[PDB]
Every structure is written in structure tokens, then in C-alpha cells.
Amino acid sequence: RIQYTYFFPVGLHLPVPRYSTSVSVRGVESPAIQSTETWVVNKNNVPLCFGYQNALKSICHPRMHNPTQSAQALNQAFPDPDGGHGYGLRYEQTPNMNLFRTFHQYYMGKNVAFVPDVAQKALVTTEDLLHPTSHRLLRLEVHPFFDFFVHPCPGARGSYRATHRTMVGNIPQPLAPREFQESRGAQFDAVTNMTH
Amino acid sequence: PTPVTSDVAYFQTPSNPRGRAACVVSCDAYSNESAERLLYDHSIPDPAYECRSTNNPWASQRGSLGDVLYNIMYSPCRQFFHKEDIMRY
């Protein structure tokens, strides 16, 4: 009994200069619509659908939603990371209400400007994050729902901690581009059937 | 799960869904220090392509979602993601 394995994707987004080859189709040419399904021919030649409602029994599950299972394997993957500049870690609260005092202490003698991990991903195109000249822009995209960074604890060496993205726009441009968000918003239009 | 700008030209040809091919037949004999650099290193491109490093970086890397769920019923993704069961070859 020979046993093969098969794979097929669903729900992608082609790049911007869209093209065609066929001449028989007239009704799906508009780039405002995006498919959310694929069709797979069954054994008895019955074309079955595949939607997210048929894919909901393994997305909505807490194995898909906690980094404690993930940040213990990443910690054994690279055990001594460079403890980076502690830029966007936390809120150092001080008893001030003069915000012009807090405005002036921080920008007075600053001479070298830092760039965080996530802010240097939102300017990269969709291909340079996948190009092999970049490790650190690619190593810290471990999980879809979450967002990892380097924390100075414990000791003098670093460790990896986690925040949740909570939105769609907190996924960066190289993994969900600009024109995808526009075509997703046009799908928001025709479902609820609003008028601008 | 996969980034939305993965490539259709990847899904046409028979490779694994990791993005990086797990053909560990090609590397040297008993070099387990060197046979990990195909599966999880990203300093080099994948053995498939020479312009991109990885199609979906949500399932290739150490600690990513392929290593979380299926790397330790039946799961056909136990075939491709388990680290110890590929190093037998």
C-alpha cells in the first residue's frame, strides 16, 4: 500500500503588476476581490470546497496562541543572544506632570539614534526579508500571532520574551503588504454593503 | 500558516512545505554537526533556491510554528518537521 503526501495552498495574494494568459474568463478580472477558498477534486470527481470554517478546528486552539511553548525552544536554539539596547521594553514611570520637562531631558544631548526590531521591518519590501543577507530581521519572525525581542534578564546575558500583535496591521509589510490591506478593505465594503 | 506573499511558483514543483528541502542524503556521512545547517540555518540559501532563503519563515526556523506543533491520532506533518526522524537518513 503505497502512501503519498499531498499539499495545496489557499488564500494567497499575487504581487502588484497582475497579468493573465487565458482568454475564456471575463468575470473575475477585477483586482478588488480576493479568493478565500480553493477547490480540490475528490476521489469520485466531486469538487470540494476549502474555507476557513472548514479550517477553524485547528487555528482556534491554545497551542496556536501561546509563546511559552515556543520561547523555550528558541531559548535553546540561540542560548546567548546579544543583549541589545533596551529601547522599547517598558514604561519607566516618574512622578512628573510637566511634560515639557520630560520632553527636554530626553532630546537634550542625544547624538546617536536607535532603531528597534519591529520598526526596521516595516520599511523592508517583501523580498529582502527573505533574502539570505539578513539574519536578525528574519530570525525574530518566529510566530504569526506574536512578536519576539531580546530581554536583558537574566544575568548579563539575554533571553527572548513575547508580545501579542492584537491586530492585522501589526503584521509587517513583508508578510502582509500594502495592496493586500487595500484589497482586504474592499472586501469589507461589499459584505456589510455600506455606501461611502 | 504562511505569509501571504508566498509564491505560487513554489507550490507547483514537488518540494516540502518547510521552504527548505530536507534532503539530508546529499550531505556527508554521520556529520550531525553539519546536517543541521540544511534544516535550520539561514546564512545560506535553501538547497532548492538561490535567491530566497525560505518561503515561509513561520514554519522553517527553530522555535517557529512548525517546530511548535508537529515536532515533538496521526499527523502527516510529523513526516517533515521532526528533527530526529530526518537525521536517520
Binding site: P132, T133 | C27, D28, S34, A35, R37, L38, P47, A48
Partner: peptide
């Protein structure tokens, strides 16, 4: 600066899948 452009370009391969790799040029 020469150590920067060298960072943006790049024995390093332990295995290869499709075959013995071949070099190209640029004219």
C-alpha cells in the same frame, strides 16, 4: 565602509539538492 558592502553581499554549503552548483558572471 568596505566591511559594510562586504556585509551586504557575503565551504559554506554543507549540502546541495539539485546538483553540483555552477558560477555565472556579469558583463
Amino acid at each position: 565602509l568596505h566591511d559594510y558592502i562586504k556585509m551586504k553581499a557575503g565551504e559554506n554549503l554543507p549540502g546541495l539538492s539539485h546538483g553540483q552548483l555552477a558560477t555565472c558572471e556579469i558583463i
